Amino acid sequence: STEIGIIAVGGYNEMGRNMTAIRVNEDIIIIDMGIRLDRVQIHEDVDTDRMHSLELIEMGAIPDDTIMNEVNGNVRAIVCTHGHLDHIGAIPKLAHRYAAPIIATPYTTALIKHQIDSERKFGVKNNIVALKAGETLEITKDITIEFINTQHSIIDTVFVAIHTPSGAVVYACDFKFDRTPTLGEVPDFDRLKELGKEGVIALITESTNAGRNGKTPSELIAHMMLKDVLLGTEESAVGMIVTTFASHIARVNSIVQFAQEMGRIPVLLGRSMERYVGTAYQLGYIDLPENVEIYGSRRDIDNALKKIMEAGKDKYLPVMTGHQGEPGAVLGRIANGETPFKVETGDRIIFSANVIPNPMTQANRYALETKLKMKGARIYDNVHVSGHAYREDHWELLRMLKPEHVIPAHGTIQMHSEYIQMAEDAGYSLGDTLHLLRNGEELYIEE
Amino acid sequence: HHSSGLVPRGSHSTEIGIIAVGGYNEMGRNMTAIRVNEDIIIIDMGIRLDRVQIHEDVDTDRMHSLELIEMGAIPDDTIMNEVNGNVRAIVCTHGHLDHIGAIPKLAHRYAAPIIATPYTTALIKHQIDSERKFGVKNNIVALKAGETLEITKDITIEFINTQHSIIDTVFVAIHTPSGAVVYACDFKFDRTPTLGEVPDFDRLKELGKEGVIALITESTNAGRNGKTPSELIAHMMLKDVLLGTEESAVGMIVTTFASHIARVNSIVQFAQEMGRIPVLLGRSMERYVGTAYQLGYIDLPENVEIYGSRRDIDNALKKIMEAGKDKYLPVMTGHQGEPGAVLGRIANGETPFKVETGDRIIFSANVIPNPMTQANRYALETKLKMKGARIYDNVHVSGHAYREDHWELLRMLKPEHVIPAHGTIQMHSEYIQMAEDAGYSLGDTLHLLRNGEELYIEED
Amino acid sequence: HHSSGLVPRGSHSTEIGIIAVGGYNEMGRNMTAIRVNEDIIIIDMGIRLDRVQIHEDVDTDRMHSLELIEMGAIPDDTIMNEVNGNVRAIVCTHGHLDHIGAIPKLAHRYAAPIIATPYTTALIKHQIDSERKFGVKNNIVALKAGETLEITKDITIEFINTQHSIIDTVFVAIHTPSGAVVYACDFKFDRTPTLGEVPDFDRLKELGKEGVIALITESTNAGRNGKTPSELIAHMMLKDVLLGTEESAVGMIVTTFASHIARVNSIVQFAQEMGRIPVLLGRSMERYVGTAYQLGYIDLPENVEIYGSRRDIDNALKKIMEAGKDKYLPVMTGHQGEPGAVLGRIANGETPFKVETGDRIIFSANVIPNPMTQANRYALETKLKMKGARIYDNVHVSGHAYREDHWELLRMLKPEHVIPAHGTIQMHSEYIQMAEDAGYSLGDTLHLLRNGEELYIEED
Amino acid sequence: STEIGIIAVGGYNEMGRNMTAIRVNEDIIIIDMGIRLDRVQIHEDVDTDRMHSLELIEMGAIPDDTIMNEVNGNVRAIVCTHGHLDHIGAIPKLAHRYAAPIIATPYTTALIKHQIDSERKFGVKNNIVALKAGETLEITKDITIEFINTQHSIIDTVFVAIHTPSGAVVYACDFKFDRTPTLGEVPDFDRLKELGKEGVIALITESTNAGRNGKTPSELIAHMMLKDVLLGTEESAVGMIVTTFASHIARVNSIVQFAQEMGRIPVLLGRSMERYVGTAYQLGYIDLPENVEIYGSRRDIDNALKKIMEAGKDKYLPVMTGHQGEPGAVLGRIANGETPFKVETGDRIIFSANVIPNPMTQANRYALETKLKMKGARIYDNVHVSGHAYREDHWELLRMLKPEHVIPAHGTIQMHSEYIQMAEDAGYSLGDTLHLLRNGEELYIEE
Ligand SMILES: [Zn+2]
Ligand SMILES: [Zn+2]
Ligand SMILES: [Zn+2]
Ligand SMILES: [Zn+2]
Ligand SMILES: [Zn+2]
Ligand SMILES: [Zn+2]
Ligand SMILES: [Zn+2]
Ligand SMILES: [Zn+2]
Structure with a gap:
């Protein structure tokens, strides 16, 4: 059988500090490692490079991955959605503790590498791999990780799809369905419907603006x-x-x-x-x-x-x-x-x-x-449009991917509550096929 | 024994009065009167559809003016029994009901023509062909944007094109021997509209340099920061x-x-x-x-x-x-x-x-x-x-001007006095702070009026 | 070849189920069911007077249960056709309509007595002497605070005095072979009330040390900081x-x-x-x-x-x-x-x-x-x-418990599980954060239930 | 004739930094000189004793009294309502520019004197006089200043009544009608009704909580x-x-x-x-x-x-x-x-x-x-009751003092707007018998 586990490590209680780990049997794929840039400012001049990981975990700041000592598996990758600090910021501070490569889309890989050139002389280090949108990289025999193009307030931002023997697990924190973008190409809809028909076991997605009504305004x-x-x-x-x-x-x-x-x-x-x-x-x-x-x-x-x-x-x-x-x-x-x-x-x-x-x-x-x-x-204030998806963007995401489970991530419990209500409109049920996880919790999917 | 000092004096003319009768305590129910000494120009006569629905049944049809005045609803023009002059015209900014809604109910008590831009005039006559009073009458006159109409020798009325949440909407400029009185309730500087013409900036600058004695303008979104999004x-x-x-x-x-x-x-x-x-x-x-x-x-x-x-x-x-x-x-x-x-x-x-x-x-x-x-x-x-x-909620853009649009309006017209209208006292407060940035002073060069109040400007 | 490790196992009993049927998505319309293996205890059956008035006419009289269920209005007990047991009692916390309002409309479908504190019972019978169904019946039983009533050998019901926005209101404690299930929707720790008795703290501590398997409690004001002001x-x-x-x-x-x-x-x-x-x-x-x-x-x-x-x-x-x-x-x-x-x-x-x-x-x-x-x-x-x-507005004090009152409630009862009820998912979220401070964990020792959902606790 | 002037110097645009001056013909009575303690924190460590008055006026901070160079009179007093920093805080920084005594109620006089013992070696100084509630002090032949007891979040807080040949001008910024106080005695109501019947030309009062409905909760x-x-x-x-x-x-x-x-x-x-x-x-x-x-x-x-x-x-x-x-x-x-x-x-x-x-x-x-x-x-947050008067407290204040004019002070223009609406309920009219002043403006009352 294939027992999939989803362990919530960072950012489901807060917005920053995102880290999720997807365990497929005994293999672990980590997605995102960000800093929380707010609750670092509460203290009097910290200078984040003077502190090592643990310091910042008791601030958090960076996600508490100590809980990864209790899980039954070994990590084979550290994937990154895009180059915001709430997603790649904790890498030079925690990724060194893991004997695993860091996979990202080129602009991210570059910016990551630029950030580690401040971690110290080296670190360990992990080898940093550049994977573009639309391409796929096998990480073990049957586990393969795919990059699917999307838009977000950063260029080159991507859905990650973890294909396993029993189906795909797609994580989509920080997106936006911009159908008329200023840069990049329009999100790969056909691939979302298609992959929807292939079989999605779980969907892990942001709930940042799920409470906001309608559809996200284009960057245009x-x-x-x-x-x-x-x-x-x-x-x-x-x-x-x-x-x-x-x-x-x-x-x-x-x-x-x-x-x-x-x-x-x-x-x-x-x-x-x-x-x-x-x-x-x-x-x-x-x-x-x-x-x-x-x-x-x-x-x-x-x-x-x-x-x-x-x-x-x-x-x-x-x-x-x-x-x-x-x-x-x-x-x-x-x-x-x-x-x-x-x-x-x-x-x-x-x-x-x-x-x-x-x-x-x-x-x-x-x-x-x-x-x-x-x-x-x-x-002139707020001449701006949010780079996160709204209720309707989420709705149609659920309608093309047709995931068997959904887990809201990247937000507070209230954001998660809004998303929950929306998902319930889609036929899902809390504690059954729709799951509210907290930082440090693991949810098991069987078969 | 000695000491000195010297001051130039005089010399002396035009007593201009501004009557706030409606829409200065609330939005809608707008009515302002521009008194040039002896002559009066009425601008806007709107209905307030808000505080009529609070009561159990609206009717609004077989009721006469007075009852709606104790609701308001319609502007209380009773205070016009106290003013010293005769109204010789009634201008309307555009065809929203907070501006022309009170016309078939109050314009009949005034022996004056109703001047508006074609589309507004059309909707006005369509409304009177519905209230059914038939009626004691007014001539409904169509004046387009960019054109001017002499009504009393020294009083002349200009229409200056602008944009707003309804098509064909206009700044009104009341020219007097000593300068222009501009009324600009419900406007917006849309430089890329879907319909209509871009507001007439050049004319606003010209008229600014000619001499504006007073500016009466909406404060609806004066508190909103920045500049109003285009209809585009x-x-x-x-x-x-x-x-x-x-x-x-x-x-x-x-x-x-x-x-x-x-x-x-x-x-x-x-x-x-x-x-x-x-x-x-x-x-x-x-x-x-x-x-x-x-x-x-x-x-x-x-x-x-x-x-x-x-x-x-x-x-x-x-x-x-x-x-x-x-x-x-x-x-x-x-x-x-x-x-x-x-x-x-x-x-x-x-x-x-x-x-x-x-x-x-x-x-x-x-x-x-x-x-x-x-x-x-x-x-x-x-x-x-x-x-x-x-x-899908609020797929919308406000048709009213923001703080910065007002800023540049003041900077083009350079009015000698400023009067916020068309809003609540808080909206007016925000507008006041904005104009205070522009060099104006409350109770001196910028005036906060309430419904039923008149400020006299004595200009030579 | 070698290596070791050791874990104690067993041993094994009581399958307790908690049915959230009403008031977990909204406030009011409250209904919970406590299933002790084979036997069921219904707690609260309230009316929601909110989403009935949104429609043009309320009626509520000549209507039967079902229609009000598609309004809700009354709790959807249809899901009780899916549960494996028979209800042998219906307890009511107090006489507010969000708690006893649905009784004359739903309690008749259940072959069970309605247990409450005297004043509540009185108001219940006064309401049935008004809905006019006459009727298929229940015995209305008056149990005062501090007293206990055996209903099924292993299931015994206790009433523990508390304060709330209505007089004579009570914690209910459902004693089972393996411990107590406490239901505390609508309460407040008023240590200086104008009426009634001060809540029974000592009993709460005793019962806390005896063993509480589950706590079901309101989250109405769990987000409100500090402690609830006294009625004084x-x-x-x-x-x-x-x-x-x-x-x-x-x-x-x-x-x-x-x-x-x-x-x-x-x-x-x-x-x-x-x-x-x-x-x-x-x-x-x-x-x-x-x-x-x-x-x-x-x-x-x-x-x-x-x-x-x-x-x-x-x-x-x-x-x-x-x-x-x-x-x-x-x-x-x-x-x-x-x-x-x-x-x-x-x-x-x-x-x-x-x-x-x-x-x-x-x-x-x-x-x-x-x-x-x-x-x-x-x-x-x-x-x-x-x-x-x-x-004079809001000369008032909330009759519901705040964050700190909940804090000490958890610290007296020390329940093995916690379930927020009587509120929206956001109210429940605040309560969740509070209990997370208390050592509890979501999906493990603290559970977020929605209307129509059952959580099974398997306790030996 | 007696021409009364009311010059707004501080705190009618903001809450802190209060200063008002009442000119009776050619004599000036100044009431309150406070610091604005918020917009001092906007700057990076100011240390208010390192700066002289002018510095702080371009911050403000302290009220801009330069405008007092344009008024036709000489000041004979500096009265203080009570010992909050929004009322007596600017004294050691501005009072030295005035050849006038500082009158206050004992607790204030003491605390003022304690604050000046930090202004420098001396200052000038003004002589500091202690006047209690219920007592009156003649400052010129016909101008006499009275202290009337009230409650506020500070002990020993007072209405000031400036009696002139044509009537009294009472200023009441920072009060509260606490009918069951913890300290001090209940406000002198009988004196307010009586003095109401004697003749009040103008009322200058706080609008802090005028928008708040009802009556202020007691300190009890x-x-x-x-x-x-x-x-x-x-x-x-x-x-x-x-x-x-x-x-x-x-x-x-x-x-x-x-x-x-x-x-x-x-x-x-x-x-x-x-x-x-x-x-x-x-x-x-x-x-x-x-x-x-x-x-x-x-x-x-x-x-x-x-x-x-x-x-x-x-x-x-x-x-x-x-x-x-x-x-x-x-x-x-x-x-x-x-x-x-x-x-x-x-x-x-x-x-x-x-x-x-x-x-x-x-x-x-x-x-x-x-x-x-x-x-x-x-x-445990906000176990507290506001020390300022609400709408009804203001209403009844207007009903016992029966002032001929009213000027809201001690607040923002919106607070003033709320007060204006309430005063309009009482029969007053804006720009006629009810006046909205800004910082730096003088309003004239004739006869
Ligand atoms: Zn992002
Ligand atoms: Zn993000
Ligand atoms: Zn309009
Ligand atoms: Zn309008
Ligand atoms: Zn209740
Ligand atoms: Zn209740
Ligand atoms: Zn104070
Ligand atoms: Zn104060």
Whole structure:
């Protein structure tokens, strides 16, 4: 027989810190190892590289994988859905304890490798393997892992399908059914219906926005709103700063496109930006006009900003990090005047990002925005679209994959509750064919 | 013995008065009066459909003005017995009921013509050809955007094109010997509309530099941060939910504001795009979109069917049920869960249409933030969900201006005074903070008026 | 060749089952079944008055069980055709309709006696002497707090005193050969009540140490932080608003839950204290407080007047209007803005009572967090405010237990399993987090059940 | 004639930073000078004594009184309602610019004098005068200032009535009609009705809780709830910490009373506590049992806490500051483990205070509470009653004083909006007999 087990290690009580392990008989396939970036800020300057794994488990921070000492099997892989820190962030801190390769899609593999180049001299290390969407990699005789293309607030994001002798186990945390994306190709629907007909034993999926009604707005909407705010203005020569996730890439591409269309020169600031968009351009996921400038260290940035100041803000579009009000982020540094560029009345600050619903980040962004307003700035908030799927996206996902079991992951118990109600609309039953797991719990499927 | 100091004095003219009679304590029931010394211009006369439904039965028909004034409902113009002048005109911004709803009930007491843009005028006369008073009269005058009409020698009225949740909507500029008084309730700076013309920015700048004595403007979304999304966004989202689906042949009902001609036009475009026959239900839509098509503001495929009375609707809806929902797209009223509206009674099954599991109900409208309509819409959605429907909420974009749109409006008109209208005191508070950023001062250059109040501006 | 390891095995008995049939997806409509192998004990059978009013007309009278099951309304006991045992009793926690409301409609299909505490039993028989089925029968048995009743040799039922928003309310403990199953829906640890006895802590500790196999308990306010305020707080606040006023002779109406005997007792004490004659209106109050006084749970001054039918009420209310509101204190129903309740129709003026400016309306009740009742209460308060009334909101204290009260409940009973009931999945989620702090584990030692679901505990 | 002017200097746009000036012809009476304690925390360690007035005005922080250079009169007094920092906090920083005495009720005068003993070597200084409730002090021939007793979250809090040739101008920011107080005497109602009949030209009053329905709960309610939580527990020997406003005094008195009734020894920790309750006991506003201990510096506190730890928490009730999660406050220091006393599972933390509705303090209190919960603590939140008046308290205030004009103060424009609606119920009219002022604006009353 094939006894499948699903062990919840991280992120089913919280949003960050995601880690799941799928045990097929005695083989283990681990998916995702993220940091929880909120409850690290509760403590007074931690500097995550000064701490080793255990420290951070009693903060968590990183998922408590000690519970993996109680499970009956050996891990053969560490798969990663995409390159957000809530998914690949814990790798350089925990993956070394496992004698297993790290499988990911190219952009992720690259960014992982870049992050480990800060773990220490080496680590152990695991060998890092790049697998693209649409391709499949056999890990043992009968266990084979497949990558299926999807969209998310990061480029190159993927469904993972673990084929076993008794069927496929697909895990889909962090997706979005964007039918008209700015980057990448539309999600592989035909493959989802087909693989649905092949046989899915279990579905593990995010419940982030399952309570939200309807279907997720396309990234094209964010594109159009940003177009509207940048170009559709009767105060053309003001001085505009755009801030967003350094990781989003699709949007940054939209923004530099816009800069080329609105006759400004796009300058990208911050280590964050340099890493993500740099790695993106180098690996050819985005094209850049020859005029763009990218600066990471404080000297490059501040120099670029004195320059950008005295030559005229009207003829520039700084694109940067700091949308959640991170002090030390370039925007936080501009708001505090710890920079040559010092904003004046009329100046437009464009936040192409949501406010993360945590008191820490909300306080930070509050303080940031008031400092900006006292310096006369005019703020455009939340010109943004969520990269997570809504109720209807989930509904149709259930209707094409037709999974035999469903396990909500990547969220709080309330998010999970919303998802549960939706799945119950689909014919499922709690504790029977629909399962609510907590961090540290293992659910068995038989036969 | 000595010491000095010097100040220039004079010299002296125009006593302008602004009468807040309706829609300054609440939204809707809007009425403002612009008094230029001796002469008066009435702007907007709206109905408030909110605090009439709180009472057990609405009627609104065989009732005369006074009763609705103790409900309000209609603006209390009794305070106009206290003003020193005669109204020589009644202008209307656009054809929403919070703006023209009180006309067939109050405009008759005033010996003045009603000036509006063609579509508005049309809907006005259609409403008077329905209240049935027949009547003591007014001339209904059609003035299009971009044109100007002299009414009293020194008083001249200009229409300046803008966008809003209904087609053909306009800024009104009351030119006086000492400058312009601009009234801009219900507007939005949509630079990429689906219908109509882009708002006339250049004229706004010109008129700004000519001299604006006062700006009267809505504060509905002045608290909302940033700039209002284009209607194109609503178009793209609707396009996304109707076409972008992997459960294609289900049976889909779309509900929206009957007045939002642009949105319904987008929708029939979509039905034409998805091979369903667009059918429009409700007396209300036949009213609005019928008037729109007759006057040629929207183009319609001949595939369209429009039905107003219950018999036409219930039978067309038999037509669609028995023939198959798959090749049809009903667009309807009832988005606020109005009982008696076609959708609410469909939800109650008081109709041939029997909605089934999987069916998609698409609300291209927001929930009006009032406990009544929130309750009705709650009940509606639970009936629909229990009968298995799949609900797409708030596929919608606000037709009102945000903080930054107001910012640039102030920066183009550069008015000497500012008056928030069309909202609650809190909405007005947000607007006040915004204008305070713009250099204005409360009780001096920016004024918070309440219903029934007059501020005198003495300008030379 | 070698190596070792050792584990003790066995030995083996009691298969206990817990049936969640009602009130696990919503609040109210509560029904749970405790199956001890072969025998079944039904606990609570409540009505849900929420999702019945969403439909146009309530009736509830000439309807039989099934229809109300597709509304629910009443708990779906159809799933009891699938269980392997016979119910040999029906216990009721207290006399709120979310607990005993479904009895005259479902208890008849079960060949079992209905066990309750005296006041509850009384109200039950009063309700069956009203549904009018006459009927196929059950014996209505009065078991007081602190006493125990053997029903099936190994199954014995204990009543343990507690406090709650209605007088004489009880923990139920189902003793079995292998331990106790405690059901505690609707409770509160009030250590200083105005009425009743302080909850029986010592017995809870004893029974905790004896062995509790399962705890089934409400999660209504498990999300609320801290510990529930005593009823004494509600008493002191009411004392504060009624007596503590510098506008003394106005005319004051107090509205509250008819079931909240303790609160009304406080109020009549106050009327007796402020020299007004306490008059109680509504069929509902005559029901509850009448039953309370007849059975001697509350003492009443002979000044009191209690009127149930419209004629008595409208005339007593003529009495009070024409004689002067100043020397009277009407206590009434209608706090949720129920149209047809005496207060709502007073607000509509469908009554001799004509409330005037200055008059005080005192709501000793919370707003039930549902859009329907929130809308009704909105409308009520606006009618009252427009007619000049002065409104005192939420002079109230919740009758349900908070997080910390639950904490100590777990720490006294030390149950082997925990099951949240009586709430939504989110309420249950909060409770789950609380119990997880207590050492419990989801799907192992703490179970989230939905309506219609059974968890088997196999205990030796 | 007598032309009265009311100049709004601070706190009508915000809550903190209160300052009003009443000009009677050419004489000026200033009431309140507070700090805004929120928007000082937006900046990175300010240390308010390192900055002089102007610094803080461009932060504000302290009220911008530069606008007082444009008014036609000379100030003859600086009156203070009570000893909260939103009322007397700006005195040592601005009062030196004015050649005028500072009048207050004894507890305030004391605490003011204690605060100036940190302004510098001296300052100028103004002479500080103690005037009790019920007594009157003539400041010029015809202008005389009266103190009328009321309750508020601080002991000895007062209505100020400025009698002039044309009537009284009463300012009542921060009150509460507590008819059954724990401390002090019930508000002087008879005097309010009487003085109402004498003639009030203008009423300046707080709008903090005017939107809140009904009448403010008595302090007796907070007393009873605290009694219930401290005594009504079936886990008697756990270890309980009580945190509250060091300034409240009434509640601290309740708490030590309770400690005496529940057989624990009351220990009070923090500079804040020592100052406020110490000054209170010394001036005889509260009685203390002989057993109590008060410790202010880190050494006394930490020593007391090691002591209190090893001897047994069961036999102790630490009462302290830190309810808004101030890092450096004793509770914040306990939650971070920067103290000998280190909380364990079951321990009860009792917050007898509300959460101040500002993102800064909400974030701070968030972080605090999560640290406490991770250490196993069980939290009792908001066992508290607001010290501000509600709609009905305001209503009856209007009905006994019968003021000819009303000006809401001490709040945001929305609070002011709520108050406006209530006053309109009372017959008043905006811009005519009811006035909405902003910071920096002067309103004239004639005749
Ligand atoms: Zn992600
Ligand atoms: Zn994620
Ligand atoms: Zn409109
Ligand atoms: Zn409008
Ligand atoms: Zn109950
Ligand atoms: Zn209940
Ligand atoms: Zn205060
Ligand atoms: Zn204060």
